Design a protein around this ligand. Structure first.
Ligand SMILES: *[C@@H](C)[C@H]1/C(=C/c2[nH]c(/C=C3N=C(/C=C4\NC(=O)C(CC)=C4C)C(C)=C\3CCC(=O)O)c(CCC(=O)O)c2C)NC(=O)[C@@H]1C
Ligand SMILES: *[C@@H](C)[C@H]1/C(=C/c2[nH]c(/C=C3N=C(/C=C4\NC(=O)C(CC)=C4C)C(C)=C\3CCC(=O)O)c(CCC(=O)O)c2C)NC(=O)[C@@H]1C
Ligand SMILES: *[C@@H](C)[C@H]1/C(=C/c2[nH]c(/C=C3N=C(/C=C4\NC(=O)C(CC)=C4C)C(C)=C\3CCC(=O)O)c(CCC(=O)O)c2C)NC(=O)[C@@H]1C
Ligand SMILES: *[C@H](C)[C@H]1/C(=C/c2[nH]c(/C=C3N=C(/C=C4\NC(=O)C(CC)=C4C)C(C)=C\3CCC(=O)O)c(CCC(=O)O)c2C)NC(=O)[C@@H]1C
Ligand SMILES: *[C@H](C)[C@H]1/C(=C/c2[nH]c(/C=C3N=C(/C=C4\NC(=O)C(CC)=C4C)C(C)=C\3CCC(=O)O)c(CCC(=O)O)c2C)NC(=O)[C@@H]1C
Ligand SMILES: *[C@H](C)[C@H]1/C(=C/c2[nH]c(/C=C3N=C(/C=C4\NC(=O)C(CC)=C4C)C(C)=C\3CCC(=O)O)c(CCC(=O)O)c2C)NC(=O)[C@@H]1C
Ligand SMILES: *[C@H](C)[C@H]1/C(=C/c2[nH]c(/C=C3N=C(/C=C4\NC(=O)C(CC)=C4C)C(C)=C\3CCC(=O)O)c(CCC(=O)O)c2C)NC(=O)[C@@H]1C
Ligand SMILES: *[C@H](C)[C@H]1/C(=C/c2[nH]c(/C=C3N=C(/C=C4\NC(=O)C(CC)=C4C)C(C)=C\3CCC(=O)O)c(CCC(=O)O)c2C)NC(=O)[C@@H]1C
Ligand SMILES: *[C@H](C)[C@H]1/C(=C/c2[nH]c(/C=C3N=C(/C=C4\NC(=O)C(CC)=C4C)C(C)=C\3CCC(=O)O)c(CCC(=O)O)c2C)NC(=O)[C@@H]1C
Ligand SMILES: *[C@H](C)[C@H]1/C(=C/c2[nH]c(/C=C3N=C(/C=C4\NC(=O)C(CC)=C4C)C(C)=C\3CCC(=O)O)c(CCC(=O)O)c2C)NC(=O)[C@@H]1C
Ligand SMILES: *[C@H](C)[C@H]1/C(=C/c2[nH]c(/C=C3N=C(/C=C4\NC(=O)C(CC)=C4C)C(C)=C\3CCC(=O)O)c(CCC(=O)O)c2C)NC(=O)[C@@H]1C
Ligand SMILES: *[C@H](C)[C@H]1/C(=C/c2[nH]c(/C=C3N=C(/C=C4\NC(=O)C(CC)=C4C)C(C)=C\3CCC(=O)O)c(CCC(=O)O)c2C)NC(=O)[C@@H]1C
Ligand SMILES: *[C@H](C)[C@H]1/C(=C/c2[nH]c(/C=C3N=C(/C=C4\NC(=O)C(CC)=C4C)C(C)=C\3CCC(=O)O)c(CCC(=O)O)c2C)NC(=O)[C@@H]1C
Lengths: 162, 75, 172, 216, 172, 172, 162, 162, 172
């Protein structure tokens, strides 16, 4: 999956080469980033319940028909509400993995690949999840490099949905 | 033989590279006259776009088949 | 392809010269702008979908003939291709911004693109108008003073503008 | 040919198929069939997700900017191919997969492993991929404009060991190279080293003993 | 791959015999049922998306272990591959209904499929349950008396049920 | 392949859990060792040719039967393959050190190597002897206190020794 | 060329992806290195004639037959000495390019690719150039990251010659 | 374009074969169908405006937020309503082409290929058009073979969207 | 390629128009000619080998220079290619007759054919003479009133003659 260390070795392996100063520079870039990523992962994890619940409610407010309309794809009943909070939790959890790994790899492998087919098949609007991701962006309270990297994955997911 | 040829003057020689133009990101357009002496030949005149890395291999391919190279230019 | 560094190297090698002190100093200045360059790449990428879609909507609003039946952007396949092209050009512009050199944009994206569009009948002037719309949106996003350490980004914004202008000129 | 045992061996669907050729002045549907045929063949019938598609290469193929062979080369050199078949495999397994994907046959001899292992180690993966596609064998079977396909039937230049080893690499129609019992292990490392072959075991569904595999 | 006609022909050729009068009459009866066969194929195809999605929803509801983290249908990629499998099996079942012979299912859909699921760890028993759910929905759709010329479709329905049972047995 | 970070991530996703505080702290500890890890990779790589050639010369000296006529390293082709194999193993050892995870070494290099050597008659015990010789040379190079910021590299050295031990065990 | 920035964009383009946090971290790694690399290039450039002349004499001292043996491939005459000093200058100049570019790309593109054919064709011993590179390593007087990156390229050339 | 005559020739051409009894039977199948398709196309064409306006109101009734919510992707203004009526008109018109052609080729080439990208890019919900297509099925008033073929294309579009 | 139906559809889509009542009526008239169209295809196909061989024999009789040594039809390979070309052209004429549109003949057979012949020295005028001979035999076969339901096939025969005429004009 796409992370700086994996990409570096993947490039050298493709070329049949030992690692060179180029790959070492990649590792230095990872080390400069890693601690901020781990801090962001911890902050999101400690706040996960609040972010997921607030994110779900933000979606319901923006799309009130989702809590008023009968259907398996909507959150009018507790069943659909539980499914919705589960899904938003998956986004938040996998985003923390990206922060730990230092790349979109976890999002690419676990969430984004095939997401279009899932949303089409089960009649789920990508706009719902875009709204949830925007809520998490505006409410995770991170700053500095932690904010920048975290928002990059949240926007990466948003762009994949749009 | 009372025929025409394609015009590859100015920028009309250019072709898209993308990620398919090899290490140098250069495409070479090989115009050849070919016949069936293997896969079926559909046209007596053909054009091939090959990267620099594969240009040598393509020439031997054309050479092995006995086909004639009429023009080569950068694309 | 070249980056901002290897562009100077290749010119020096063809002359058989070491880089001068002025050339090294110029690259040192480029390194000092690196954080601004990375932020600009991040900001454009983080808004890629909105930039493409908003510009495409504006293009079709101002050029309704493109989407009418028989228009070049009519039918789902041609519209999908058109939106794909806008994203491709934006992606390669961000590549050029990342490397600091137009070679990746020129060598991989723009070379032969005009001939492709002329052969297909894609209106190049309309593509350039689309690229122009993406440019103004992209530069505003890059220039947004909120949520970022404040400073002067005029140099990188000018560089990004040039890459967009190259793309518009190549297709028009 | 293969007639009586075709269905049992998983060959009947390929008996019923024809080579996918991109004719000059091809239509839109022609290009789509090539892209589908190339993805199924070169990526070993793995499911391809929309995020994994090589949209740029598909565009150039549709435009006539790259031929079928150059499209095959672009797919084979992509990060998608390397992720599926290079980064997690012994190079002998990689060589096995390259032969099946790009030449539609199994390796014949240890000499082929020697050639491609050295070529990868000395010049890299992209150089090795070029060797398959620019080979005389590729030229004579597929040329510029035909998607590679499995060569089950006997041809000039064949060896009998190739036939038996095809069913070591091909494990049925409803199957992918990454979804076989031996998983990542090289199928032919022992067979090539000792110049031995094994009794053909047909695919599951049509053969009760489909799962037989010898021990170390 | 055989159809209902070539299945008999292949057996006759292996014996070096002309088809008997009884065999030709049996094929004539098959032709008399052809309109019902085409209708059943059309009805299943026209509801293919609903049959797949409804069956998938029912399977995951009764087997929540499939979709929890670590489950074989967890993550979008595996989930999408799972939905593709259901659609593919349904698609080939319609092929067998269209041709009147199971060979297309055996030769292509179920050829190597058990090896695929064992190698990947896909729970074959759960696929069989999903195929069973699609079967129940498909047969009801085929049997719907509304908006069609009334008649007895028990024979074609029994044949279609067999193709579903074949697929379910091949995986578990 | 996995690196040190993605190995923990993949395990967490299968359990559907956020990384625990202890897990994040453990990875933070790994980050603090990053400079030493990079230096160790750089030092082995910078001496790669000497490590391979010196180990090979030592191996043939203790084991002259490898290079006698008919010996397994005899003829230029086989000697070149032998030197190549030593370089391949060293290369993937440095990869595993770089990533902090043995997966790349296991997947690319060691998975199937024993089967290959057994089939061809390559003496696996002698390969393991060569690998051990590269290990002693490589660790001595990593531990050299001259020309580097002083500190404790014992943990990194132990990990590298483990990868060499894994390579030797895979073939012996 | 093989440099962190071009390689990062090349890999992203192969996947048709926008640049992500992984590639941004590659850039940060490059930025951490570049000033040291530029300083290393200046120091080598300012000392080039001393290093090149010293390296040539070191080769002559270690391989005295090169200055005493008649032949096109040897340096017994001023012609061969000039060719030798020129070649060592090429190594040093292209090594400075690697420091400027932050990768082995210039060495690969300009010198290393095809060096074996040249040395075989013109009967030039790789050991001669190894000794010259060893001299430059021992005499460039760099420290810290400048030393590490410079020695990585000098070792890269030595390994290619061995 | 998938139509019985085009696929008959293309398959024969791919085999390098003259047409045989197989392809002639395909032609007879088309001839049995063609008149019903043409009459179905006529009936839908004559009733096009009533079907399109009725379909659009069916969508607005089922999804009232589309006519209440501001946004470029919604129909709260005449601009959005005109776009929506236009889109539904495209679906109906291209369906009549399928009846004329005898296959899904017109739908595949003009509408379905790339529709997922468009709806994702412009935040259009496939469920909206599914509802529009369902209204057309319920209200075109066809019978017999005309009904069956017309509904096959409408269901083909619905399945493509789901 | 287009058939008789898709040709009208493509033109209508480019104008954003439903097919007019007149256009639908014209296609109904085409449907009414279907059986005669199918018979014409079947009759030419059933006599294809005789049509090609008789035309080739008559062609070489009237143009002995083609088959004399050095002639373009001399040697087995060139004779075989020549007979193949005649069979190819006849095949694509039947394709056009079957579909009711010349696109298959033009796109797949005739486009580029004159350039191929001029490039390789094939006398296109002689090819045209061979096509005319095939035209005469094919039309006589189509027009034979024996063993077929009597009716007026003049429109179909006129259409077939046009495809032969285009083939003759394309190569000359
Ligand atoms: C065991 C491996 C030996 C050891 C290592 C060690 N290194 C550091 C610190 C640094 N090493 C580097 C490395 C590089 N700088 C570059 O520019 C490049 C070339 C691309 C490399 C490889 C760096 C950047 C640092 C940090 C800054 C510094 O100059 O110190 C340490 C100190 C602790 C730390 O983790 O930083 C250590 C211990 N030291 C020994 O004694 C072992 C023989
Ligand atoms: C069991 C399958 C159900 C059933 C079917 C049934 N159908 C018919 C007759 C016909 N059905 C068709 C079908 C089509 N006409 C078209 O144009 C197309 C679209 C391409 C289709 C799918 C046709 C042509 C006929 C014949 C004419 C007619 O309309 O009747 C029957 C009657 C018996 C027969 O075989 O003809 C039956 C029984 N009927 C049921 O009650 C089941 C729910
Ligand atoms: C000009 C072409 C000549 C001609 C043709 C002609 N044919 C018909 C009618 C039919 N021909 C067929 C054909 C076939 N039936 C089969 O089973 C096969 C094998 C696949 C074929 C080729 C059919 C089905 C018909 C309809 C029934 C019938 O036999 O009449 C006509 C009559 C008009 C019509 O369009 O049906 C005509 C005119 N007749 C001539 O005199 C020309 C020499
Ligand atoms: C919340 C914003 C809205 C909502 C949600 C909702 N989702 C489903 C069903 C599924 N959600 C997913 C998504 C994922 N599965 C994964 O494994 C991952 C990646 C790790 C993701 C993102 C899937 C695959 C399904 C289908 C299978 C399942 O049910 O688990 C439903 C139910 C749909 C149905 O028809 O059963 C709902 C309700 N719905 C709303 O209205 C909210 C605004
Ligand atoms: C330019 C258009 C705008 C702007 C940019 C700007 N950025 C900085 C400084 C930094 N920006 C970053 C960026 C990141 N940190 C991360 O972890 C990541 C995610 C992977 C990114 C993208 C960093 C590391 C710095 C340095 C630390 C700092 O915050 O100061 C500056 C300040 C000067 C500098 O170049 O460092 C500026 C000017 N500022 C504007 O006002 C423009 C709108
Ligand atoms: C959108 C603003 C305008 C528009 C675009 C449009 N483009 C095409 C077709 C192609 N576009 C490309 C371009 C590229 N492909 C690549 O891989 C890259 C990177 C190297 C680029 C720049 C190509 C190659 C094609 C042809 C093949 C393909 O279809 O993908 C179309 C379709 C043309 C047609 O008739 O099929 C369209 C619609 N059209 C407009 O009207 C806008 C102004
Ligand atoms: C004839 C005396 C007997 C016989 C033969 C028979 N063989 C096959 C099929 C194949 N034969 C081979 C053998 C080879 N292929 C090679 O390349 C070489 C070495 C260069 C050999 C020896 C192969 C591989 C096949 C299968 C592939 C193919 O045929 O192209 C058949 C046909 C089998 C079938 O149709 O299923 C037959 C009939 N059969 C007898 O009964 C005779 C005793
Ligand atoms: C869904 C109900 C269940 C499920 C399914 C599942 N399947 C796979 C992977 C594959 N499925 C196939 C099957 C076919 N491919 C074909 O081409 C054909 C038709 C000829 C068939 C029948 C194949 C070959 C694969 C592997 C290829 C690939 O790219 O996946 C997966 C993915 C497993 C993984 O690890 O990715 C899944 C999830 N899983 C369940 O839990 C359900 C019971
Ligand atoms: C003699 C002209 C000069 C010389 C020779 C020398 N050679 C080696 C070591 C090796 N020689 C070979 C060569 C071959 N091995 C083969 O199998 C074949 C092909 C059949 C050949 C040509 C090899 C492979 C080696 C290395 C392994 C081994 O020792 O067998 C040495 C020792 C090198 C070392 O580092 O041990 C020497 C001394 N040396 C001179 O000075 C002569 C001018
Ligand atoms: C050297 C210390 C010992 C030795 C080695 C030796 N190996 C071979 C042959 C092969 N080596 C490999 C190895 C690899 N392939 C891979 O994919 C990987 C990871 C990337 C590895 C490590 C393979 C597959 C072969 C077979 C192909 C080839 O010949 O190159 C030989 C040659 C054996 C022969 O020619 O029969 C030799 C000599 N031999 C010794 O005696 C040393 C102990
Ligand atoms: C109606 C059910 C709902 C609705 C519609 C709506 N659509 C758009 C914009 C577009 N619609 C299309 C669709 C097509 N274009 C084609 O060429 C074809 C194939 C022949 C189709 C089906 C496209 C491509 C667009 C985008 C470009 C364009 O404007 O034409 C809008 C506007 C979206 C925007 O952001 O401008 C709207 C409003 N919206 C609803 O709320 C209705 C329920
Ligand atoms: C003689 C043993 C018997 C015989 C001969 C006969 N041949 C033809 C016609 C042709 N013969 C050839 C052969 C060749 N043409 C070449 O260019 C070469 C290669 C250099 C060869 C071997 C060909 C191609 C033809 C057809 C074209 C032509 O007429 O030139 C005929 C006439 C056949 C016809 O239909 O006109 C005859 C009579 N016939 C016998 O009865 C002899 C026992
Ligand atoms: C026969 C009446 C005349 C004649 C013919 C002749 N043609 C060729 C060579 C070619 N003919 C074609 C044409 C096609 N190939 C196709 O695939 C199709 C489309 C499906 C067509 C229309 C081509 C492409 C060639 C060249 C490649 C090939 O030969 O297969 C020859 C041979 C030329 C040579 O010298 O090799 C000949 C003899 N020649 C005459 O004298 C007659 C007037």
């Amino acid at each position: 999956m796409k992370t700086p260390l994996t990409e570096a070795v993947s490039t050298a392996d493709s070329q049949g080469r030992f690692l060179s100063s180029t790959e070492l520079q990649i590792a230095f870039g990872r080390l400069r980033q890693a601690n901020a990523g781990l801090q962001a992962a911890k902050a999101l994890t400690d706040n996960a319940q609040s972010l997921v619940n607030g994110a779900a409610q933000a979606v319901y407010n923006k799309f009130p028909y989702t809590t008023q309309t009968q259907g398996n794809n909507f959150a009018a009943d507790q069943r659909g509400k539980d499914k919705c909070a589960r899904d938003i939790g998956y986004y938040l959890r996998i985003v923390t993995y990206c922060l730990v790994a230092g790349g979109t790899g976890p999002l690419d492998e676990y969430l984004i690949a095939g997401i279009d087919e899932i949303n089409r098949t089960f009649d789920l609007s990508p706009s719902w999840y875009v709204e949830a991701l925007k809520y998490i962006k505006a409410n995770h309270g991170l700053s500095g490099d932690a904010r920048d990297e975290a928002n990059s994955y949240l926007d990466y997911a948003i762009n994949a949905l749009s | 033989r009372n025929t025409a040829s394609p015009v590859y003057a100015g920028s009309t020689a250019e072709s898209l590279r993308g990620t398919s133009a090899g290490s140098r990101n250069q495409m070479y357009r090989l115009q050849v006259i070919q016949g069936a002496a293997g896969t079926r030949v559909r046209r007596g005149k053909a054009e091939y776009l090959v990267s620099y890395d594969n240009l040598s291999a393509k020439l031997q391919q054309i050479n092995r088949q006995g086909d004639t190279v009429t023009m080569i230019s950068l694309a | 392809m070249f980056d901002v560094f290897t562009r100077v190297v290749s010119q020096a090698d063809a002359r058989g010269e070491y880089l001068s002190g002025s050339q090294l100093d110029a690259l040192s200045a480029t390194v000092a702008e690196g954080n601004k360059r990375i932020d600009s790449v991040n900001r454009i990428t983080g808004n890629a979908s909105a930039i493409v879609s908003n510009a495409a909507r504006a293009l079709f609003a101002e050029q309704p003939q493109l989407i009418q039946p028989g228009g070049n952007a009519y039918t789902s396949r041609r519209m999908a291709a058109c939106l794909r092209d806008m994203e491709i050009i934006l992606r390669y512009v961000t590549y050029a911004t990342f490397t600091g050199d137009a070679s990746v944009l020129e060598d991989r994206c723009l070379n032969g693109l005009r001939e492709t569009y002329v052969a297909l009948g894609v209106p190049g002037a309309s593509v350039a108008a689309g690229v122009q719309k993406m440019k103004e949106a992209a530069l505003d996003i890059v220039n947004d003073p909120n949520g970022i350490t404040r400073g002067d980004c005029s140099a990188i914004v000018a560089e990004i503008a040039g890459y967009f202008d190259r793309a518009a000129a190549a297709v028009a | 040919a293969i007639t009586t045992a075709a269905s049992r061996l998983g060959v009947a669907p390929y008996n019923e198929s024809r080579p996918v050729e991109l004719r000059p002045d091809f239509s839109l549907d022609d290009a789509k069939m090539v892209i589908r045929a190339v993805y199924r063949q070169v990526l070993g019938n793995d499911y391809i997700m929309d995020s994994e598609r090589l949209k740029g290469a598909e565009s150039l193929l549709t435009n006539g900017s790259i031929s079928v062979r150059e499209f095959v080369r672009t797919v084979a050199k992509s990060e998608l191919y390397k992720k599926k078949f290079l980064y997690n495999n012994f190079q002998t397994r990689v060589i096995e997969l390259n032969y099946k994907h790009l030449l539609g046959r199994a390796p014949f001899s240890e000499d082929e492993v020697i050639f491609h292992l050295d070529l990868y180690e000395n010049q890299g993966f992209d150089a090795d991929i070029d060797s398959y596609i620019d080979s005389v064998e590729y030229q004579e079977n597929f040329g510029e404009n035909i998607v590679p396909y499995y060569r089950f039937n006997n041809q000039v230049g064949d060896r009998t060991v190739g036939f038996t080893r095809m069913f070591r690499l091909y494990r049925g129609y409803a199957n992918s190279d990454r979804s076989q019992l031996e998983r990542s292990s090289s199928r032919l490392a022992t067979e090539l080293g000792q110049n031995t072959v094994s009794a053909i075991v047909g695919p599951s569904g049509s053969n009760a003993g489909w799962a037989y595999r010898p021990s170390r």
